[PDB]
Design an enzyme around this catalytic site. Structure first.
Site, PDB file in Angstrom:
ATOM      1  N   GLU A  74     -18.619  21.786 -17.696  1.00 50.98           N
ATOM      2  CA  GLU A  74     -17.435  21.024 -17.391  1.00 50.98           C
ATOM      3  C   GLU A  74     -16.531  21.521 -16.281  1.00 50.98           C
ATOM      4  OE1 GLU A  74     -16.191  18.097 -18.904  1.00 50.98           O
ATOM      5  OE2 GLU A  74     -18.281  17.780 -19.663  1.00 50.98           O
TER       6      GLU A  74
ATOM      7  N   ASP B 159     -12.166  13.038 -11.299  1.00 51.84           N
ATOM      8  CA  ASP B 159     -13.519  13.459 -11.588  1.00 51.84           C
ATOM      9  C   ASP B 159     -14.575  12.523 -11.051  1.00 51.84           C
ATOM     10  OD1 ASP B 159     -13.563  11.382 -13.403  1.00 51.84           O
ATOM     11  OD2 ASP B 159     -13.902  12.660 -15.173  1.00 51.84           O
TER      12      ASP B 159
END
EC number: 3.2.1.17
Length: 173
Positions: free
Chosen positions: A11, A20
């Protein structure tokens, strides 16, 4: 190597809100906030978006975060984020039993997927879960590779997939 390290790897970690891979307002060790918007429709939508982000943020944090957090803070959410996932799994009548059938390393693999795509989505891998639960690692591996998850996040998926198959951490080692 444990689930923590594993997703910490997978992550990433940022202490200031960033857009993201999936277009979401995100922070820390992949703690999503808001869903970023379309192709030039703002301001004001932009502003509204980020603010909502911040708000979501301040909420989880307990303070007026100007979209900037700390390692400690990120790390706090991460653990939470992990817990929630374990929980989804164990409440979920589809996942639960698979999980119960798994071993320590393999569990982390399932957790990862849930962490990444959520309980529901993971719960849809009907056939793969079957195989998983039957200890058909290679079959499972092969199948998992035909997925959208995989097509969209191959490196990561690859990593998660090798864990299920070998039952090691080789792909993180």
């Amino acid at each position: 190597m444990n689930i923590f390290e594993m997703l910490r790897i997978d992550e990433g970690l940022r202490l200031k809100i960033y857009k993201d891979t999936e277009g979401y307002y995100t922070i820390g060790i992949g703690h999503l906030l808001t869903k970023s918007p379309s192709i030039n429709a703002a301001k004001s939508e932009l502003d509204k978006a980020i603010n909502a982000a911040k708000s979501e943020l301040d909420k989880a944090i307990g303070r007026n975060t100007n979209g900037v957090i700390t390692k400690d803070e990120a790390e706090k959410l991460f653990n939470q984020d992990v817990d929630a996932a374990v929980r989804g799994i164990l409440r979920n009548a589809k996942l639960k039993p698979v999980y119960d059938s798994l071993d320590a390393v393999r569990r982390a693999a399932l957790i990862n997927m849930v962490f990444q795509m959520g309980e529901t989505g993971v719960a849809g891998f009907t056939n793969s879960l079957r195989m998983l639960q039957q200890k058909r690692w290679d079959e499972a591996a092969v199948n998992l590779a035909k997925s959208r998850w995989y097509n969209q996040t191959p490196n990561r998926a690859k990593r998660v997939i090798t864990t299920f198959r070998t039952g090691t951490w080789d792909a993180y080692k």
